[PDB]
């Protein structure tokens, strides 16, 4: 299924620390953020998507159209400019963020009532799992 709509509660978070250090996130910010649980609210209509990821310390919003390149400024994270592109590989939603860092992006999919989000940067991979609220 290609339908990520809804509110998603984090159930599992693996190696968020390695991801954030690959982004060179500062120390005080990093080890507050590795404690946190996230909630995702996603609105998907065709190619149009809107994320909103929330926590008590770090929040992240992105809006994009699948198959349209867009410039992203990751002000809430590492404060870098990247050229982002989100496309479909089968039923997996794939984002590439062309920038200074190699292999930066994320992937995603639904595995029967659960949402999986994989964040990558350099040789680091963080895996997050959410349940549909
Ligand atoms: C997928 C749906 C878009 C959406 C993307 C997204 C990317 C990254 C994150 N992070 C929170 C830890 C990484 C900084 C969250 C997020 O949420 C979304 O809903």
Curated annotation (Swiss-Prot):
It comes from the Eukaryota. All-trans-retinol binds at residues 40, 108. InterPro entries: Calycin, Fatty_acid-bd, ILBP, Lipocln_cytosolic_FA-bd_dom. GO terms for biological process: epidermis development; fatty acid transport; vitamin A metabolic process. Keywords: Cytoplasm, Retinol-binding, Transport, Vitamin A. It is found in: Cytoplasm. Its main location: cytoplasm. This is Retinol-binding protein 2. The gene is RBP2.
């Amino acid at each position: 299924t290609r339908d990520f709509n809804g509110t998603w509660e984090m159930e599992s978070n693996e190696n968020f620390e390695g991801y954030m250090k690959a982004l060179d996130i500062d120390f005080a910010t990093r080890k507050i953020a590795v404690r946190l649980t996230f909630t995702l609210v996603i609105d998907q209509d065709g190619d149009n998507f809107k994320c909103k990821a929330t926590s008590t310390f770090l929040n992240y919003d992105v809006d994009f159209t699948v198959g349209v390149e867009f410039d992203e400024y990751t002000k809430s994270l590492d404060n870098r400019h990247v050229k982002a592109l989100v496309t479909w590989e089968g039923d997996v939603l794939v984002c590439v963020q062309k920038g200074e860092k190699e292999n930066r992006g994320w992937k995603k999919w639904i595995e029967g009532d659960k949402l999986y989000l994989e964040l990558t940067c350099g040789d680091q991979v963080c895996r997050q799992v959410f349940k549909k609220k």
